[PDB]
Every structure is written in C-alpha cells, then in structure tokens.
Amino acid sequence: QPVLTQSPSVSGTPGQKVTIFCSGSSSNVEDNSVYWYQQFPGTTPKVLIYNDDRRSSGVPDRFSGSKSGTSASLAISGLRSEDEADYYCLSWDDSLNGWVFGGGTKVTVLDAA
C-alpha cells in the first residue's frame, strides 16, 4: 500500500475550489520536498508543483501547493473542466530509502445544473 495517504475522490462544478490532501510522516514529507503530479487517463503524469509550493512553468496560479508538519495539500481554485484528472503527491522517504507516491485522488468536474 502507498506510504502517503491521499484524500478520497472529490468533485466540483466549474468555478468551485477543491483541496486534495496528502498525509505522510516524519520520515518523508516533514523534512523533504513534496511534489504534485497531474495525470490524465492513458497519459504520463506531469509535475504541477515542486518543492512543496512552486508551480511548474505554465501551471495556473489557481493551483496552490502547501505543506504543514507531515501534511501537504493541493488546492485547485476556479475549477475548469480540463482539471479533471488524477492527482498524486510524491516525497522522498528516508526510512524506506525510496521515492513514495500517494495512491492518487481523482478530481471530477461536474456539469452544473
């Protein structure tokens, strides 16, 4: 099982805000950088956030990464249909001696009505 524990699936309509959580431990996210990846079906995952809160080139400011203690989050404000994807957190783990991913959180964007 994944060493990092992510939020269950979340949904929103366009314009809403969602927050995805990534919980780790003292051996991983507490002192090591967290990265966030976005993955569409049948596509390689791409880095959206690195070093806890830095946006990759081209990533909209409505994507915000943060970290506190052994917990990290990715907030997507102003949700757009193209944001529907699986999101994964990643951190180095000093005990396991590996790069560990969360199990993923699917963000679904519902048609408002």
PDB file of C-alpha atoms in Angstrom:
ATOM      1  CA  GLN A   1       0.000   0.000   0.000  1.00  0.00           C
ATOM      2  CA  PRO A   2       1.069   3.610  -0.539  1.00  0.00           C
ATOM      3  CA  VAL A   3       3.089   5.207   2.239  1.00  0.00           C
ATOM      4  CA  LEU A   4       1.458   8.603   1.654  1.00  0.00           C
ATOM      5  CA  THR A   5      -2.294   8.736   2.289  1.00  0.00           C
ATOM      6  CA  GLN A   6      -4.378  10.940  -0.014  1.00  0.00           C
ATOM      7  CA  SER A   7      -7.906  12.367   0.196  1.00  0.00           C
ATOM      8  CA  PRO A   8     -10.811  10.397  -1.256  1.00  0.00           C
ATOM      9  CA  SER A   9     -12.253  11.372  -4.646  1.00  0.00           C
ATOM     10  CA  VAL A  10     -13.653  14.891  -4.866  1.00  0.00           C
ATOM     11  CA  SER A  11     -15.969  16.673  -7.278  1.00  0.00           C
ATOM     12  CA  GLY A  12     -16.898  20.224  -8.080  1.00  0.00           C
ATOM     13  CA  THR A  13     -18.612  22.334 -10.694  1.00  0.00           C
ATOM     14  CA  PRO A  14     -16.660  24.879 -12.721  1.00  0.00           C
ATOM     15  CA  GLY A  15     -15.540  27.856 -10.643  1.00  0.00           C
ATOM     16  CA  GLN A  16     -15.507  25.970  -7.349  1.00  0.00           C
ATOM     17  CA  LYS A  17     -12.465  25.176  -5.228  1.00  0.00           C
ATOM     18  CA  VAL A  18     -11.257  21.714  -4.260  1.00  0.00           C
ATOM     19  CA  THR A  19      -8.488  20.708  -1.864  1.00  0.00           C
ATOM     20  CA  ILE A  20      -6.597  17.427  -2.122  1.00  0.00           C
ATOM     21  CA  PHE A  21      -4.703  16.198   0.935  1.00  0.00           C
ATOM     22  CA  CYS A  22      -1.512  14.144   1.236  1.00  0.00           C
ATOM     23  CA  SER A  23      -0.592  12.839   4.695  1.00  0.00           C
ATOM     24  CA  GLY A  24       2.847  11.392   5.432  1.00  0.00           C
ATOM     25  CA  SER A  25       5.192  11.059   8.397  1.00  0.00           C
ATOM     26  CA  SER A  26       8.390  12.380   9.933  1.00  0.00           C
ATOM     27  CA  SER A  27      10.355  10.109   7.571  1.00  0.00           C
ATOM     28  CA  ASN A  28       9.027  11.663   4.368  1.00  0.00           C
ATOM     29  CA  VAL A  29       7.025  14.849   3.880  1.00  0.00           C
ATOM     30  CA  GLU A  30       8.020  16.546   7.146  1.00  0.00           C
ATOM     31  CA  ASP A  31      11.558  17.499   6.082  1.00  0.00           C
ATOM     32  CA  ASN A  32      11.546  16.532   2.395  1.00  0.00           C
ATOM     33  CA  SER A  33      10.049  18.382  -0.568  1.00  0.00           C
ATOM     34  CA  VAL A  34       6.617  17.392  -1.770  1.00  0.00           C
ATOM     35  CA  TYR A  35       5.789  17.271  -5.483  1.00  0.00           C
ATOM     36  CA  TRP A  36       2.351  17.052  -7.104  1.00  0.00           C
ATOM     37  CA  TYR A  37       1.670  15.300 -10.397  1.00  0.00           C
ATOM     38  CA  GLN A  38      -1.329  15.566 -12.688  1.00  0.00           C
ATOM     39  CA  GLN A  39      -2.274  12.530 -14.753  1.00  0.00           C
ATOM     40  CA  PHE A  40      -4.885  12.143 -17.467  1.00  0.00           C
ATOM     41  CA  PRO A  41      -6.041   8.669 -18.491  1.00  0.00           C
ATOM     42  CA  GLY A  42      -3.578   6.978 -20.847  1.00  0.00           C
ATOM     43  CA  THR A  43      -1.027   9.777 -20.397  1.00  0.00           C
ATOM     44  CA  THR A  44       2.256  10.090 -18.451  1.00  0.00           C
ATOM     45  CA  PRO A  45       1.967  12.005 -15.161  1.00  0.00           C
ATOM     46  CA  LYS A  46       3.335  15.554 -15.289  1.00  0.00           C
ATOM     47  CA  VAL A  47       4.748  17.677 -12.458  1.00  0.00           C
ATOM     48  CA  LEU A  48       2.471  20.568 -11.423  1.00  0.00           C
ATOM     49  CA  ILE A  49       4.050  21.554  -8.106  1.00  0.00           C
ATOM     50  CA  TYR A  50       7.611  21.012  -6.872  1.00  0.00           C
ATOM     51  CA  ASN A  51       9.445  21.909  -3.648  1.00  0.00           C
ATOM     52  CA  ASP A  52       6.148  21.997  -1.705  1.00  0.00           C
ATOM     53  CA  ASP A  53       4.680  25.120  -3.308  1.00  0.00           C
ATOM     54  CA  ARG A  54       6.481  26.055  -6.530  1.00  0.00           C
ATOM     55  CA  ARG A  55       4.432  25.998  -9.725  1.00  0.00           C
ATOM     56  CA  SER A  56       5.939  24.406 -12.820  1.00  0.00           C
ATOM     57  CA  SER A  57       6.151  26.610 -15.883  1.00  0.00           C
ATOM     58  CA  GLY A  58       2.696  27.082 -17.417  1.00  0.00           C
ATOM     59  CA  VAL A  59       0.775  25.992 -14.316  1.00  0.00           C
ATOM     60  CA  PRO A  60      -2.044  28.454 -13.463  1.00  0.00           C
ATOM     61  CA  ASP A  61      -1.857  30.298 -10.141  1.00  0.00           C
ATOM     62  CA  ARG A  62      -5.193  28.754  -9.176  1.00  0.00           C
ATOM     63  CA  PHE A  63      -3.163  25.629  -8.389  1.00  0.00           C
ATOM     64  CA  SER A  64      -1.629  26.117  -4.940  1.00  0.00           C
ATOM     65  CA  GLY A  65       0.582  23.702  -3.024  1.00  0.00           C
ATOM     66  CA  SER A  66       1.223  23.875   0.685  1.00  0.00           C
ATOM     67  CA  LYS A  67       2.733  21.862   3.496  1.00  0.00           C
ATOM     68  CA  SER A  68       2.427  21.830   7.283  1.00  0.00           C
ATOM     69  CA  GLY A  69       4.028  19.255   9.571  1.00  0.00           C
ATOM     70  CA  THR A  70       3.509  15.839   7.999  1.00  0.00           C
ATOM     71  CA  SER A  71       0.588  17.049   5.866  1.00  0.00           C
ATOM     72  CA  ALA A  72       0.513  18.528   2.366  1.00  0.00           C
ATOM     73  CA  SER A  73      -2.293  19.826   0.181  1.00  0.00           C
ATOM     74  CA  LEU A  74      -3.033  20.899  -3.367  1.00  0.00           C
ATOM     75  CA  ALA A  75      -5.828  23.436  -3.728  1.00  0.00           C
ATOM     76  CA  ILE A  76      -7.407  23.985  -7.125  1.00  0.00           C
ATOM     77  CA  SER A  77      -9.372  27.207  -7.229  1.00  0.00           C
ATOM     78  CA  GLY A  78     -11.549  28.277 -10.145  1.00  0.00           C
ATOM     79  CA  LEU A  79     -12.080  24.687 -11.245  1.00  0.00           C
ATOM     80  CA  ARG A  80     -12.165  24.131 -15.008  1.00  0.00           C
ATOM     81  CA  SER A  81     -13.306  21.060 -16.959  1.00  0.00           C
ATOM     82  CA  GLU A  82      -9.733  20.417 -18.123  1.00  0.00           C
ATOM     83  CA  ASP A  83      -8.720  19.974 -14.464  1.00  0.00           C
ATOM     84  CA  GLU A  84     -10.462  16.598 -14.305  1.00  0.00           C
ATOM     85  CA  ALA A  85      -7.609  14.181 -13.650  1.00  0.00           C
ATOM     86  CA  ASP A  86      -5.849  12.031 -11.073  1.00  0.00           C
ATOM     87  CA  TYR A  87      -3.503  13.941  -8.769  1.00  0.00           C
ATOM     88  CA  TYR A  88      -0.576  12.322  -6.947  1.00  0.00           C
ATOM     89  CA  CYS A  89       1.752  13.564  -4.258  1.00  0.00           C
ATOM     90  CA  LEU A  90       5.393  12.446  -4.088  1.00  0.00           C
ATOM     91  CA  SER A  91       8.117  12.730  -1.454  1.00  0.00           C
ATOM     92  CA  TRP A  92      11.442  11.117  -0.598  1.00  0.00           C
ATOM     93  CA  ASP A  93      11.247   8.740   2.381  1.00  0.00           C
ATOM     94  CA  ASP A  94      14.456   8.449   4.422  1.00  0.00           C
ATOM     95  CA  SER A  95      13.413   5.296   6.263  1.00  0.00           C
ATOM     96  CA  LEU A  96      12.220   3.325   3.251  1.00  0.00           C
ATOM     97  CA  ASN A  97      15.012   4.774   1.120  1.00  0.00           C
ATOM     98  CA  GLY A  98      12.660   5.487  -1.742  1.00  0.00           C
ATOM     99  CA  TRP A  99      10.537   7.998  -3.596  1.00  0.00           C
ATOM    100  CA  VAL A 100       6.992   7.337  -2.407  1.00  0.00           C
ATOM    101  CA  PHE A 101       3.755   8.346  -4.139  1.00  0.00           C
ATOM    102  CA  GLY A 102       0.291   8.685  -2.677  1.00  0.00           C
ATOM    103  CA  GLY A 103      -2.431   6.455  -4.089  1.00  0.00           C
ATOM    104  CA  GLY A 104      -3.920   9.320  -6.098  1.00  0.00           C
ATOM    105  CA  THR A 105      -7.020  11.498  -5.803  1.00  0.00           C
ATOM    106  CA  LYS A 106      -9.449  11.800  -8.701  1.00  0.00           C
ATOM    107  CA  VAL A 107     -10.936  15.250  -9.240  1.00  0.00           C
ATOM    108  CA  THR A 108     -14.209  15.148 -11.178  1.00  0.00           C
ATOM    109  CA  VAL A 109     -15.666  18.311 -12.677  1.00  0.00           C
ATOM    110  CA  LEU A 110     -19.454  18.042 -12.868  1.00  0.00           C
ATOM    111  CA  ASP A 111     -21.599  19.894 -15.365  1.00  0.00           C
ATOM    112  CA  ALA A 112     -23.502  22.416 -13.242  1.00  0.00           C
ATOM    113  CA  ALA A 113     -27.296  22.011 -13.066  1.00  0.00           C
TER     114      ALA A 113
END
